Design a protein around this ligand. Sequence first.
Ligand SMILES: O=N[O-]
Ligand SMILES: O=N[O-]
Length: 129
Amino acid sequence: KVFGRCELAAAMKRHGLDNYRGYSLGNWVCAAKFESNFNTQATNRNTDGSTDYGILQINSRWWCNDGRTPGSRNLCNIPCSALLSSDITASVNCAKKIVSDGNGMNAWVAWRNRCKGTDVQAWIRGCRL
Ligand SMILES: O=N[O-]
Ligand SMILES: O=N[O-]
């Protein structure tokens, strides 16, 4: 599923991401835009053989099991395919664990490079939240 901007913002708010660990809703929408273009089916292979999955491009090296990343961890206790569903519950819950890990949103390369220090509130402007 490819989410609309305000549609994703609303789902993220409903799932409790707005100000989670002090990151405003705009930060999460910005990250999702640049990680996956709001597409829940997005997948990208990393150089080390792991893969990033879903709207927030959650990585199989640490967070999920894709049956092809030998020696990796499954810290969110899910198959990586659960991250590709039209329902973002699994992605959101795993993202909450990731952002709590110690590095905050710097865990997301796209966020650090394209969202951090910018006017992220512009990503939720015009939405009925
Ligand atoms: O969800 N339409 O911006
Ligand atoms: O992601 N474990 O193959």
